[PDB]
Design an enzyme around this catalytic site. Structure first.
Site, PDB file in Angstrom:
ATOM      1  N   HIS A  50     -15.623 -10.310  -8.696  1.00 40.14           N
ATOM      2  CA  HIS A  50     -15.294  -9.343  -9.741  1.00 40.14           C
ATOM      3  C   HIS A  50     -16.297  -9.373 -10.890  1.00 40.14           C
ATOM      4  CE1 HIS A  50     -11.543 -10.390  -7.594  1.00 40.14           C
ATOM      5  NE2 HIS A  50     -11.282  -9.101  -7.711  1.00 40.14           N
ATOM      6  N   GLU A  82       0.825  -1.206   0.000  1.00 43.64           N
ATOM      7  CA  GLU A  82       0.000   0.000   0.000  1.00 43.64           C
ATOM      8  C   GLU A  82       0.861   1.259   0.000  1.00 43.64           C
ATOM      9  OE1 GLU A  82      -3.273  -0.168  -0.376  1.00 43.64           O
ATOM     10  OE2 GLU A  82      -3.538  -2.315  -0.025  1.00 43.64           O
TER      11      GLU A  82
END
Ligand SMILES: *[C@@H]1O[C@H](CO)[C@@H](O)[C@H](O)[C@H]1NC(C)=O
Ligand SMILES: *[C@@H]1O[C@H](CO)[C@@H](O)[C@H](O)[C@H]1NC(C)=O
Ligand SMILES: *[C@@H]1O[C@H](CO)[C@@H](O)[C@H](O)[C@H]1NC(C)=O
Ligand SMILES: *[C@@H]1O[C@H](CO)[C@@H](O)[C@H](O)[C@H]1NC(C)=O
Ligand SMILES: *[C@@H]1O[C@H](CO)[C@@H](O)[C@H](O)[C@H]1NC(C)=O
Ligand SMILES: *[C@@H]1O[C@H](CO)[C@@H](O)[C@H](O)[C@H]1NC(C)=O
Lengths: 50, 595
Positions: free
Chosen positions: B487, B357
């Site tokens: 997804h 991140e």
């Protein structure tokens, strides 16, 4: 929203000159006629400080 | 006076208003995500509504500029990004029906509860319990019951929804001057107008095929090895010549194989490189973990963290009284504001995720000088790739000995390298055939190559032919087995993981040859190398202003996707798999011989 700056102007400023005009910036060929919209933008934009 | 100057002034006004409105929207979304309270919910809704209306009106004013008389590439790219209709090109009734369909798919997926028959007093949800029962259980019939029950219920409640969804998305794409919705998704990789670096929408699929043809032998060996280890788990149910049973892949859908490390270990006697005990003994808090990540990022030459990052990020769970989203997310709020939403635990996995991140945040930080609509990755793979390379580099034993987590007397023999590389193969190589199969199925169903009444028969055949996984029982068209994944059900592109996987190892080779590493690729560390950081930052500073082919040529010296770094990374594991597959049969048959 009390700090503003000029984003659009027809020509560059001379040294030690100020511009307090609120005229709508005419970027195209059509006349603005004082009303904002497409190709007619208000030059003074707010510095939204946070 | 010309059209181009009008476009520049319009883009300047759009960029200023966009950055202000985006900042307000992102701040409201952040306030909802770190503090789940109803006033934050309505504030986020109002800001999202105002942002969507703002982009609607700016796109309406943006489509009055034709693109054929604009010669500047950056202005053309910004106007091409702005003028996309999305779902707005349809009528209001069809657009409202499409949003209603997307919302009801989201509510079905989020609130889908499947439990045991004859015991309905309480039931188990997918995210808390089904993931655990899929990853941890060793019982064949229990996993079969959970798999068949969830796919049966979700398929029966989702099949007409997907039936309308494919038609509506096809109408949206054909109204948007695209061949199909698959072409619309492939348009993110499209490069037009640049000589020599031109990339078409149609070429990507054969390029993926060209990579996959060289992916296929290594995966086959891994598949055979996995089958052998599953033969140890299940003696009679799995056939030597056939495929793997579908409900034995360690996840609900078979996307990741990383849950099979316990079953498929090469050397169980050897310890792992888990450094959680070193963190908990020396009391390594989350703040100093992020400080160590910042030290890694300043070792390679990238700029350190901002003061507002340390002040405004919430790197620890606040408490029981305040509820926050536990998903690790990197936030680019705009106006130089970068934050990380992460509920850190004292583990090695959270350390690697924090590096990932922070790589996302560094990528967002580098293109701050760019205009707002170009403040993204050059394609969808680069953004995750630049974080995954940091996750690769931070996990090396050299880096752990450097920062004091690993002892200097640790012996790095070939056996721990083999088991670490096999874990990385189960995480990385395992998802590639599933991703390519799912994307190619979605591309053909949007294209109309697959008939409406032949979906499942085609899909399972490809699962036999590509992934090498056989179904337990045949499924007819009453089921919708693809739609059980997150997804596909919520309208997300899936080829980003495949492209990210290739770009990860391409960037890793480019940095390791930049940093003059003299050993195998998996031992390489990019720490203490300024030249590698500069070479990477040359790509990081561009953002979306340049084509992704040009960014790839800037990093790896090639303008097209290459599979050679991935096979070069797994070369000793490839030799080991060749050594231990002498008795077993490499490859699979499409027959239903196991079950
Ligand atoms: C979270 O929201 C509640 C709602 O009133 C508020 O009392 C609390 O101060 C908020 N927490 C933070 C850290 O802002
Ligand atoms: C394109 O426009 C940008 C400003 O938006 C300018 O800096 C750049 O020089 C222009 N490119 C060309 C080739 O004129
Ligand atoms: C978006 O839709 C409008 C309305 O049909 C159309 O005039 C415009 O050309 C479309 N823009 C693009 C880029 O397709
Ligand atoms: C970042 O580094 C500069 C010098 O490299 C230093 O002056 C500054 O204080 C550092 N910022 C933080 C937050 O450590
Ligand atoms: C590791 O290296 C030793 C020394 O050559 C060798 O005997 C052994 O077979 C190797 N193990 C593996 C799994 O390659
Ligand atoms: C990188 O530099 C720091 C400080 O100069 C040093 O402590 C560290 O050991 C170096 N890392 C390696 C792998 O040499």
């Amino acid at each position: 929203y009390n700090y503003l700056y000029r984003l659009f102007r027809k020509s560059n400023l001379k040294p030690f000159e100020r511009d307090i005009s609120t005229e709508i910036y005419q970027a195209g060929n059509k006349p603005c006629n004082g009303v904002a919209g497409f190709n007619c933008y208000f030059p003074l934009r707010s510095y939204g400080f946070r | 006076s010309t059209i181009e100057e009008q476009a520049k002034t319009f883009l300047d006004k759009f960029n200023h208003e966009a950055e202000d409105l985006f900042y307000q929207s992102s701040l409201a979304s952040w306030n909802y995500n770190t503090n789940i309270t109803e006033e934050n919910v309505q504030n986020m809704n109002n800001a999202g509504d105002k942002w969507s209306a703002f982009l609607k009106e700016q796109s309406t004013l943006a489509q009055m500029y034709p693109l054929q008389e604009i010669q500047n590439l950056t202005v053309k790219l910004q106007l091409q990004a702005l003028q996309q209709n999305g779902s707005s090109v349809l009528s209001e009734d069809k657009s409202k029906r499409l949003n209603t369909i997307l919302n009801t798919m989201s509510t079905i997926y989020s609130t889908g509860k499947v439990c045991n028959p004859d015991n309905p007093q309480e039931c188990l949800l997918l995210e808390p319990g089904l993931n655990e029962i899929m990853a941890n259980s060793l019982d064949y019939n229990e996993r079969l019951w959970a798999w068949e029950s969830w796919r049966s219920e979700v398929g029966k409640q989702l099949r007409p929804l997907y039936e309308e969804y494919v038609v509506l998305k096809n109408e949206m794409a054909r109204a948007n001057h695209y061949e199909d919705y698959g072409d619309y998704w492939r348009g993110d990789y499209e490069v037009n107008g640049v000589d020599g670096y031109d990339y078409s929408r149609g070429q990507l699929i054969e390029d993926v095929e060209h990579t996959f043809e060289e992916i296929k032998p290594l995966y086959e060996h891994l598949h055979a090895y996995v089958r052998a280890k599953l033969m140890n788990a299940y003696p009679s149910y799995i056939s030597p010549i056939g495929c793997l049973p579908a409900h034995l892949l360690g996840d609900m859908w078979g996307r990741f194989w990383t849950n099979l490390y316990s079953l498929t270990v090469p050397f169980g006697q050897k310890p792992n490189i888990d450094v959680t005990d070193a963190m908990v003994d020396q009391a390594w808090d989350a703040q100093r973990i992020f400080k160590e990540a910042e030290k890694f990022f300043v070792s390679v030459g990238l700029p350190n963290m901002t003061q507002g990052f340390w002040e405004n990020s919430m790197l620890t769970d606040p408490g029981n009284v305040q509820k926050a989203v536990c998903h690790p997310t990197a936030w680019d709020l705009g106006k130089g504001d970068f934050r990380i939403l992460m509920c850190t635990k004292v583990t090695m996995d959270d350390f690697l995720t924090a590096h990932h991140e922070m790589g996302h945040i560094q990528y967002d930080m580098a293109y701050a000088a760019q205009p707002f609509l170009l403040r993204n990755g050059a394609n969808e793979g680069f953004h995750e790739a630049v974080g995954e390379i940091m996750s690769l580099s931070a996990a090396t034993p050299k880096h752990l000995k450097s920062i004091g987590l690993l002892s200097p007397d640790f012996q790095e023999d070939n056996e721990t390298e083999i088991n670490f590389l096999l874990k990385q193969a189960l995480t990385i190589v395992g998802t590639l055939p599933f991703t390519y199969m799912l994307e190619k199925w979605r591309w053909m169903v949007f294209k109309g190559e697959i008939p409406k009444d032949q979906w499942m028969k085609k899909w399972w055949e490809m699962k036999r032919e590509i992934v090498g996984v056989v179904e337990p029982v045949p499924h007819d068209e009453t089921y919708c087995d693809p739609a059980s994944l997150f997804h596909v059900s919520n309208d997300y592109s899936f080829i980003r993981y495949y492209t990210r996987t290739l770009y990860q190892f391409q960037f890793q080779e480019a940095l390791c040859q930049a940093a003059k590493h003299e050993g195998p690729l998996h031992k390489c560390d990019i720490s203490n190398s300024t030249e590698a950081g500069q070479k990477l930052f040359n790509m990081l500073r561009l953002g979306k202003s340049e084509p992704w082919t040009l960014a790839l040529e800037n990093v790896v010296g090639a303008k097209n996707m290459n599979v050679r770094p991935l096979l070069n990374y797994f070369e000793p594991l490839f030799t080991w798999l060749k050594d231990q597959n002498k008795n077993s049969f490499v490859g699979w048959s499409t027959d239903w011989s196991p079950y």
